[PDB]
């Protein structure tokens, strides 16, 4: 089963963690908690931006180009990405935009972080409609000594 996990700035703008204007260690901890011990699928740009395989998870990179790092698994299609995961209960797709769009239709859950910050960007998470999803968990948090901005964690199930 496919799950998408993303951090959204205002107006659903998305980008690479290392380039966003916030510093939210609480969100990275949530991300870790929610992906640990699960396969993670990402596109090429996100892989390059993270730089090293995320430990404790199977890292899968979706790319039409040949692989350039033997430390991760490279696939060329959505179906191939899912076959390479094996029989696992949940597959975490971690973006970017195009990757989110290719898996959305198959996704059954969404783990989102809504961050209260305005960012200019050209890439946005795709629209999800109120009728197709149920918010099953939500948790609001204020900015603090370690977290630059306020954020809300949320879990949605396809309805």
Ligand X SMILES: Nc1nc2c(c(=O)[nH]1)N(C=O)[C@@H](CNc1ccc(C(=O)N[C@@H](CCC(=O)O)C(=O)O)cc1)CN2
Which segments are annotated as binding site for substrate?
A: 5, 27, 52, 57, 113
CB atoms within 10 A of CB 122: 8
Binding residues, by number, are 5, 7, 13-19, 27, 45-46, 52, 57, 63-64, 76, 95-102, 113
Annotation: binding site for NADP(+): 7, 13-19, 45-46, 63-64, 76, 95-102
Residue numbers at the binding site for ligand X (CB under 6 A): 5-7, 17, 20, 25, 27-28, 30-32, 50, 54, 94-95, 113
For residue 22 the two structure tokens come to: 């916030």
Helix (DSSP H) and strand (DSSP E) numbers for the chain: 4, 8
Nearer to Ca ion, 14 or 20 (CB): 20
Stretch that binds Ca ion, among 19-27, 104-112, 134-142, 145-153 (CB under 5 A): 19-27
Between 124 and 141, CB nearer to Cl ion: 124
Site for Cl ion, rule CB under 5 A? 43, 45-46, 96
Of residues 98, 106, 157, 103, the one with CA closest to residue 133 = 157
CB-based burial, 70-96: b 16+ in 10 Å, e otherwise: eebbbbeebeebbebbeeeeebbbbbb
Max CA separation in the chain (angstroms): 43
43 binds, among Cl ion, Ca ion, ligand X, none (CB under 5 to 8 A by kind): Cl ion
């Amino acid at each position: 089963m496919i799950s998408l996990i993303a951090a959204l700035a205002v107006d659903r703008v998305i980008g690479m963690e290392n380039a966003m204007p916030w510093n939210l260690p609480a969100d990275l901890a949530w991300f870790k908690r929610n992906t640990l011990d699960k396969p993670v699928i990402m596109g090429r740009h996100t892989w390059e931006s993270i730089g090293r395989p995320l430990p404790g998870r199977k890292n899968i990179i979706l790319s039409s180009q040949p692989g350039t790092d033997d430390r991760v698994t490279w696939v060329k299609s959505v179906d191939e990405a899912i076959a390479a995961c094996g029989d696992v209960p949940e597959i975490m797709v971690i973006g970017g935009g195009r990757v989110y769009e290719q898996f959305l239709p198959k996704a059954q859950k969404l783990y989102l972080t809504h961050i209260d910050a305005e960012v200019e960007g050209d890439t946005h998470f795709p629209d999800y409609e109120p009728d197709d999803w149920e918010s099953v968990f939500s948790e609001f948090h204020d900015a603090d000594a370690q977290n630059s901005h306020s954020y809300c964690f949320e879990i949605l199930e396809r309805r």
